[model samples]
Target chain A: LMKNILAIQSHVVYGHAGNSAAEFPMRRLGANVWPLNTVQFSNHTQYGKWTGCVMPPSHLTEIVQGIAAIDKLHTCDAVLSGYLGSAEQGEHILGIVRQVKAANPQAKYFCDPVMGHPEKGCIVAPGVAEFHVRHGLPASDIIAPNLVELEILCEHAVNNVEEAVLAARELIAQGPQIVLVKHLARAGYSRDRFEMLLVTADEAWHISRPLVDFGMRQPVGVGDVTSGLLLVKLLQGATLQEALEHVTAAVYEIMVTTKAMQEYELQVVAAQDRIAKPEHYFSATKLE
Target chain B: LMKNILAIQSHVVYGHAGNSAAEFPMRRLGANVWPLNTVQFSNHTQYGKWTGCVMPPSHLTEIVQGIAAIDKLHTCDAVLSGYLGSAEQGEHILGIVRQVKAANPQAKYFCDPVMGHPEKGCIVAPGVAEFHVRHGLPASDIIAPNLVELEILCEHAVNNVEEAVLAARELIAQGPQIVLVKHLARAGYSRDRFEMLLVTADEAWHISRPLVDFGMRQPVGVGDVTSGLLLVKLLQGATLQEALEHVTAAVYEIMVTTKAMQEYELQVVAAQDRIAKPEHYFSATKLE
Candidate 1:
């Protein structure tokens, strides 16, 4: 509630995805969210149809500079960047981090490298994935990547749990003090449940949740929810293990409610109460 | 809470104005607000400085069309349009109302003819004030205007209370079912209090609250808050007179809270609880 997060992402008018998916849950938890939209879409692109415009990088620079003029930039506790419209926007985001750091040195950048599908490979705007691997990583304090994005960042494939840990460590070696491997389903893992690994400089932990699908097309923006909730939890003084526990529990409630409602858009507003006081809890086991 | 509002307005990153001012409070009231921003500025223009982009009219078309493709346009209960980037955008907004109404014949268009200031005359994009007076009102089901806006739309200056009521009736003839005279302080009244009048076809009522300024520049977006809350209250089953009482009490609470905090931007987020259920209620008196 005391945290200020600048979430620069996609804004969809019709459904919850990107900032729409991310901002409400954070607000429900009492955070002051300043959303800077990268694109204004009618809906998420997952439907193979979306209409909007990707904002120019210069526009973003203007907004940040304007905020600085009013001397509120220093109050931004952290910046959260997601789906960029272009690689130019990606590079511009690093410049924003520089501005944010200049205002407050303690500010962290949580960059969710939002590209790549486990089956479809790279899916972001042209050159966006490369921009993240080469530049976006070194500038970020934290990065949340699903298995495919994990491999893209690591420049290698993981066959099992141990290799997943190595890929996360590989990202930490480049920059990020913490890496949240958002989803890790290796060849041997059962399809009934999915695991998430969190690796910090000092230690690591993992938690798993049952695969939630009741004959429904699983909703998009689950990773967006995870990264957003993770940022808020850490800002609220939660350690990596603690954020993992709380975020897992909260996200499960969101999905369970969303599943039960049988709606394509997340039932985040409907589950606002339980999101704040989750009905169930999950814990992460520290790994050797 | 069960209402779905399409809020077309300005989006500012740093402080509250337009959708940034409108969306959260409506959300706190449990309405699902689909915000479509006409422009994205770093902050409100009250400070005489802002930076961002005005979305092209085509982009607005694309978004609404996209929403229609998903077959969810029928769920839209009302369309709320505030600041427009241009007359072209204003013209385009009427088109969107057509789309929304086509999908849901019962949908209402709350066109906030947002181009007048009590002090500075016509402080909007080129030809926008003209757009509102000539084209915007006839398409609207509800119109919330301040003194200057009401005068501008009615094409006359209102010197006293009787004139103000007649001016509101003049707007009722223009097509809006409800005319909210947001701030009316004619020549004879004490400036220590501010009054708002709600005029419908059958009846009119007015409410007043003590002026909240404690030696500070009164905040902008007060009308934005009034209009947004009125839409929610009306959609939530409040009659015009009941809505007058509720919106007046809630907005007074907002201004009072904002005054106590001494912030230029509204303390809408901080005043969320009190806004939902204001501490002191202000009732409306029927006007002849």
Candidate 2:
């Protein structure tokens, strides 16, 4: 019941995204999350004009050293990293992954490879897009990448559902034991539906749920919540299929609530009850 | 029962203190807390060798400005501040209060003027201890200060329980509508008990509860929790006495749980049930 996850992500004071999006959901799911923020933004950058600072890479290492000083590194069961600020920051995170694994050989690194959308074209700080596969993926046990990131990670494009499954399998062939394609989109994509694919060494599954309508304004933390929910469920010993099913339900509930309120920010606080126990469970079908 | 609190405080990534200590509890109680961190520390400063960066005051202004861009400032009901980094930061916070008030005339400012402890002898920045009184207090509608800070704000040393009550009243006369002297420590302080006194313009009350024995240690953030709980309760329309009783029970539950685990950090997550609904309620005695 006391699983500890070291989540390295961005934090926004006024909105739900990155650590702010993940922390509440993860904690509510009964995990102790130690959030190491890469940057502290006033709000997500979608607002076009926001103020914040990216933490220096050395400072991240110093914090890890401070955790070591308190003898807490070994107790950390998993390391989660998302939203790379720079290639230097990615290297520092890899160093943290190394330190954590050295402390506890059983610790798994779950990376949510967030290279910007194809539409946005690499929103990360200048040089971090390459660092995701070059340095980040190989050292991990698990990774969750959206459609755009998965294509970039595997160096392949997906034109259909089958190709998307193949792209995730491509990632598993490289290093990570599990690769979750968080959002699956292609030729047959439906505006009314949202899809996800999960793959491991010998298994693959695809699942779908109805899309939420927020009057043309969806929440900013959709990917973060999915990645965060899946990580917490896995840490709590949920099977891959079960974690996928649970994350689907909780996220649907959050979307529904956000849409109902017509709010751009995820109604995470308002929809917390469903996160703990969703009213509906979306099932995934095995891909034979 | 929807309330929004803009909490300007320090944020630690690893352990609980400042906003890290306050956000979950306030959120659990059904209030949305926008935590504007003054500094981002790897761990609480109690660790002695932690790493962090104090955010520039201009950055703080930009954040508030960003919130304004989204038109969310008026929905904010109260502003809570703690752990001043500098006189510049306090001035920035006061400016935020003015901005918030200007946006919503009904908004209230709750200041937790933490001007270092007598034991620590002004641990704040080189010049902020004086700023708490000179520029911060008059702008605040409600002020919660620990014993040392109370003495500093009131400009009179308290030697007993009566003087502490008088000290709080002195603060009310100066500018604030309510002054909560958190942790009443003077001639008859007790190791076996923890005490607090709340003084409003027309009413005063004192509360006490048995202390937890952590073998040789107590958790940090005791005053932050007290101040946070009180602010949340008042925002939810809780009377002063009811908020005091609730905070007393919840803090006791947290302490008892923290002691049982023998953990240096507060058992905040484990004690969530009690914080939502305490096992016991300790009533306050209204002072004549």
Candidate 3:
């Protein structure tokens, strides 16, 4: 059966990031996506300047309540969220998660813990990181966190592939059934390569690709797209390994295309066909 | 060269309407779309009960300024707008249009005058209709209006194909170069058939399709998608006649798919491939 998703994220008018980056790929994959914007900006904040306003928690709640009022909440197969502007907004999203689950217990919640960058440190508003640790994790069925966010959640150093896998397990132990460690860097891995790991209670899988040098471009929203693709593939009934491979390959292709264009934003539209059917294949290694 | 569009319209959480309906088709056709929301709602107002907020005109201006700050507004190839919430927002949109045109004189504006339904009469907020006639029509390079909206813009009754053409011509005489009259009905046309007329300064073309009986299922967002597809086709360098045939064929296929699935909203994602590469073709007849 086809699935419906409720996507809560930032919406940027000029570039691909947050929901602007996530929704179209999922829609291209043939899912019904209902996107609720948490923030409306002229472009991604990576540019160091942007324009738009963040929605108040009450506004988010009102939109969710409206969907429920129309009896459409039950149709959602999953709730995908990223980059809450405030802790109150996180609470509102969790409240929506509860309502969606009550309406349909089979619905999953995929949380992309979008904190600050690994290189830049925590750039999000205050209280957001603590809110994810205290409330967001246990509520999520699937969590995608970068190395820095995973370290923040686990409260320890995760500098290599091994430590990254251990940190992901810590998250799975907390509540989420699966934790995907994105942008995993290992001590032994070539600087030209980057890896992403998907860890569950039963197994762990990792996929590596040649990292294209974006060179000061600071590609944003790769994690958001990763989480979205994983959620969509999982909803489409792909196994964890399959989902990881498809997402890795597609994101790699998009990154390559963006690099070729030398644009600040992801070339999502130009590489949409590659998104719908990723021609490149990357193999996922089982690390039992 | 790929084109970039600034799409300002309504944003709904649950269904495809406004920008939600417009952005994906344009994106799939490989254009970069920057979508700015005028109103954020749980769903289209067709449901009668919903939740969300209307953005203030200042906020809209602020976003456009933000884009301009980044020196990105000049790159916009066209501006597409629909479903204005107020006269103030209309003014803001016109402001942005002027800014875009000043930055790039060749840029065009495509306005879908979403004033009302033919059978249901005007359902928009008061003052919106008058705003479009006084401000929106003259500013637009291309205008896509339904039968009733065209009549309202022309300030007279348009009863048949010939009257529709003349009414479109009246708008052209005022300012707009091309007018697309969608959901056009005539006295002799079969109840099972519906027509869409594309009128320019020199010629008019009409394409008719067998109406799928949606019986009690009012399909929202058809007009939104129609305008979006037409704009994208025009941006892609399609001739006026080519754009008309492509838009009609793709929309017809989507309508057929939606009716088969018995869904109220357009099955845009499910029918996306057909949208990207519509298999069915509809021919337009040049009016004598």
Candidate 4:
């Protein structure tokens, strides 16, 4: 049909909530996104009982192969990958990337190195980090890593947002063309709060906002929004600054507004509405 | 001192991905969760450059007033609410519930009736749905609504999963309860599809599973796994079946497995661990 972006990820049994957050935002911003599940889930599995199959790397390879054999294989624009079920799954995704690039060298590859936070710790898996760093990071055009994930990827526990940004730059040097250092929570200079940082090859932007006093209840899927917003702005041809502003402003709006745990619960469609027609603001500042 | 639930409906400035997702889940699951602010945001005034807000009832006195206050006050175990940013905010959340519940008798309240779906729908705005319906739903023990909010409360077009579940049971009739029909899909017995029904009564349960073959791309929140899972299970003490198998599996495994989408995203977690544990399964179940 049209040029497309294939999202190689887990197939959630639930309708939404998962790696889909990243893929959908890209598609909403005007890319043809086709998500391939690495695992099939019932729901989020957070509320409890769940039963599903994690698509084996072998199965994943088959799906990717089939997609590659499609009528207009050359028309595939990109491959977005995140949250693999296993190390084998990660390898399979990497393999798919190579295959896709061979077919269409123009395709961009974005990888969200999803790990865990300092507080939550690394709940992903043992060798998953190495998988992302050694293989996944090298193959990616864009890499989205939050403060915790960034630290894990860099193999250094960063103490502040500045360090996190620097680490992102280091990651960029490693391979990814663009690296986003998310959840950049730093002691606010003006007010006692936290800030988020978006770092890329050209510039590093830091958005400082008054962190609401919600001690232990940090919501999930924030990186999804961060990366989603970045992808949306990137597709719209907005500069790095523009993309950062879009991401910061959109994420800030949802965080400060909704009382729900996950932003998408309240801000999904609203975020989509602002993709092409992004609003500009002075709340976010450029650190670099 | 006095414990009471506060519900809010508004758009956050930074957006809802990080903070909101972390907020409700942390409070409901970890510590004592308070309900205030219809919308949680990184900052405000970014609506123009970013996304729109999820508006709550401009007049919320009716909703708030019903919550028994001290003397006549209603003491609360927790306060929870979502997506309120309008006249209904004060009327329903502050004017009525906060004051009444605080004064009369206290009780716990949690809310997560987010805005419109990612695709195209606004079940809670003016000229479309009745304000009374939208305002009435969130004032309860637990509140959870998927892509399209609970139609019974919003009084929008009654069709499909969102609307059907909205009408499936009147929240009030369900008794001092906030039920979120989350990640609901109407695949009509398709093999490739599945839906989630997250109900929080005495115990929380996440019910979810696979759909036959109904083709649908997973979306963003898919009814936030952390949101629905933590709040419903903790507050209601829902059993595995009563909560729905499909939802539990979806929230834990599915949300963690997939990537972001126009409709949903994957929540990241170990699929094998979830399969082994499925915390909600052994924790509670419904009586015959």
Candidate 5:
């Protein structure tokens, strides 16, 4: 059954980064993706030329209310959010998810937690990190955070896979049903490979894959793509392990293609084709 | 007289996208750069593994107040701010600027006006644009906004050079002594590669240069470099025309260098060398 997934995002300009990366994969997988923009722009703000109005939290809430008024909320099998543009946006999203859950309890709420990355750090505005930790993550059924984000959520450093798993469980205790920690490449580990830890209510698994040796600079939206792929796979009835394996292998293949193509893009078209049974050059194991 | 410049910005741990980009140029130019971080992380917020705190705005205010108590307010020549992490940071910066300005009426304040870009759109939280436009821009001596931002400021579309000029002038009328509209490119305009329109009480100039075809994706922090260079030169007694010429040439050269090196970074040492002779590449004609 094709599930209608409502993906509320900060905005859609360039639509190449952030939630758009996720929305594209979800749509390709046959899930109906409904996008609500918190802000709009011509492209990424990094380009130094941008225009748009920030939709107030009230406006967002009202939009969700309008969605409910049309009885479309019941059709939403998942409500996914990434990069709340403000504390008010965070609160508004929380409220909207609650209302959607009231109508469709089976609908999962997934958050990409797009605050910052380990290499890029946190660019979230003031009070936003607090809101993400105290409220946003708590509301999410699944949270896709990187190693640094997991640390921020758990408020401690995780040196090894064991600590990383513990951190994910700690985050789960705070509310999320699953936490996918991305980019866990520790010292003395194979430079050609990396790891992602998927944590659940009762158990955790570690998925390892050969890291694509693309020496190109990392762009803005790769995480959004990875998280989006996993979220959609889970919705497609893939078990957590299956989703982790599929998403990891797919992302690895995309990176390899990007390197071979002499481009730095995520290769969404290639991903669309290989997403179901991605090349699994590495293996994953259930840790605890 | 070397006036002390205090720049409060959001610091990322990994990517160096925000305040570091802003602060580095200022410090390179021999300005006493005091960075009050709104957020601290291992890298820029984009790599998605960030774990850090968004420092309270009150803490920011306290830093400013503490500096003021040390009698630095009177010595402060300019207060340059970019990428505030919150509304509280905005309010705190505003309060600090007011306090510092009250102590030294001659001090200049420059606001980078980083709400979001038109190409990438807005990344700041909800109500942030309102807070920034209504509160921040008014207190600025010079507001550096790109073409998209110029349109947003004027609440209208600016299609061509003339329209952009008018929009910039409109913003100037709002209180800023000088308004710089950046990131405006004229299609098939061979005479000037890209245009930067500068308007002040005495004169306005549409300065242009040949577009440097780096043939790569644009990198972040070029504007921060541009703005930093512009402000530094303006403070160092270069006329607006001289300042524009110097900054334009410097940005072009730096962009080329960054492209060659496979990074979007400023060649500060080279730029410093070019500053000694500001008349080499540009001759600004007065706009009638």
Candidate 6:
């Protein structure tokens, strides 16, 4: 049976970010995606200017209730969310996760706790970080966070591979079954390379890849794409290690293509072939 | 160069309609589709129950302005719109069509004037019918209207092939360069079959096919899909006859697959192979 996902995120008209970034790749992979947007903007905020409106918590509740009214809520296989605009929206997302779980106990929740970017520092509304740590993590089955978000979730700094794994473990202890720490730069890694760490209750694995420089035009929405692809892989029955390898390879190829084209946004549609069948393969190593 | 389209339409979470139905096929065909929703609902109104909110005209203006702020409006190759919730929204859509034209004089506008279904009668808000005829059609380069909407636009009933062509030509005289009248049925057609008429400024062609009976499970969004495919074909340089033939074959196969699966929604993704490379072919007869 084809898997169905309820993806909640922001929507941008011009660029790839939030659901705009996440839904397409999953759909291309053959998953039936039902997207609910928390906000509608002209483009990602990275462009420095945008216009649109945010859906209030009440509006989000109404849309979820509407889905349930049709009795289709039970059909969802998973729910993936990213970039909450406010703590209230985060709370509403948790409510949706609870509803999906109630409808289908087997359904999983994947949360990409998008607190802030590494270079931009914290930019989300106040209390969003607190909500993700206190409520969001406990409700999620899988959590994907970058190094900055990981530090916020653990309330500590991570500077090495060991520290990063410890922070992921700390998150795992909170309730999630799996944690993916992205954009990991540790003591031994060269400035030209970056790492991604995946941790589960039993083990942790790390994969490193040479950075593709966009030369001041780093396209946004890489994390959204990563989480979307990961959910699809897991629902398709790939093991954590296998999913990590596939996702990393696909994202790398897409980024390389985007940089080569010098496009402001991720060239997801143009480089979709690389997304489905990546030309390059990168392996993840099991960390002891 | 890849074709870029600004697709304005309704967005539903559970089922395909408006941009949800249109954007995917365009993306599958490698068009860069930037979608702006006029309304966001849980599912199509055919469900008799749904939840969501409509974007006020000001909100729509802001999103368009946001895209223009990045100076990317000129990059759009076409504007495709469907299902205006109100006359005000239709006016806003015309504004967008004008903006895209101003930015790129070569940009075309495709309007799928979704007024009502054959069986459901006219279900849209009161003033929408007038808005399409008075404003929408004049601004559109290509217009796709069902037989019922054709009657509404022409303010006269059409009962035969010749009458349908005449009505379409009436629309052409107003401003549109091409008109596609779909779900066409006249005296000679069997209940099991239907006709689609493609009328340009100087030529008219008709194609007939055996209707796949969904009975009580009649699907929505077929028109949206048809318009999307038509736009892609035109953008790819297909002639009116060629575009009509390809779209009909693809939609027929998709409907057949959807009926076989006993699903209420169009099985677009599962049947996408047929969409990309249809198994069946239908020819259009010149209606001289």
State the lDDT of candidate 5 residue by residue for B4-74, as single tens digits.
Answer: 56666655422335554654445444444445556543333333233344557777676565555545457
Q: What is the C-alpha lDDT of each candidate?
A: 0.84, 0.83, 0.86, 0.50, 0.66, 0.86
Compose the digit string of candidate 4's lDDT tens values, residues A31-113: 44454545444334433343444545675566555444433346566777766557777888788788878888977787888
Minimal lDDT window, size 10, model 2 chain B: B184-193
Worst 10 residues of 6 chain B by lDDT: B116-125
TM-score of each: 0.92, 0.95, 0.97, 0.48, 0.48, 0.96
Top TM-score model: 3
Q: Residues B1-288, candidate 1, lDDT per residue (tens digit)? A: 268999989888877889999887887777788989888888898877878888888888889999999788999999998877789988888999999999999999997787767666777888888898998988899998888888889998987767878888888898898888888866224555888888888788878888775453658788888899999998888888888887888888888778877678887777776767888788788877
Classified by CAPRI criteria, candidate 6 counts as high
Candidate 6 on B137-190: residue-level lDDT in tens?
888888988887889888899888888889999999888899999778552245
Q: Please give, as one word, the docking class of candidate 3.
A: high
Q: Order the candidate numbers by lDDT, best to worst.
A: 3, 6, 1, 2, 5, 4
Worst 10 residues of 3 chain B by lDDT: B116-125
Give candidate 6 regions above 4 Å deviation: A187-190, B186-188
Proportion of native contacts kept per candidate? 0.56, 0.64, 0.90, 0.00, 0.00, 0.84
Point out the higher-scoring one by TM-score: 4 or 6: 6
Q: Per-residue CA lDDT of candidate 5, range A160-205, in tens?
A: 8778888888888888898988777552134446878888878787
- Evaluated at residue B254, the lDDT of candidate 4 is 39
Those runs of model 2 whose alpha carbons end farther than 4 Å from true positions after fitting are: A118-122, A187-190, B118-121, B187-191
Q: Lowest lDDT 10-mer window, candidate 1 chain A?
A: A116-125
Where does candidate 6 chain A have its weakest 10-residue lDDT segment? A183-192
For TM-score, candidate 4 versus 5, the one ahead is: 5
TM-score of chain A of 5: 0.89
| Clash-forming residue pairs, model 6 | none
TM-score of chain B of 1: 0.95
Q: Which stretches of candidate 3 lie over 4 Å from their true place?
A: A186-191, B118-122, B186-188
Chain A TM per prediction? 0.95, 0.96, 0.96, 0.84, 0.89, 0.96
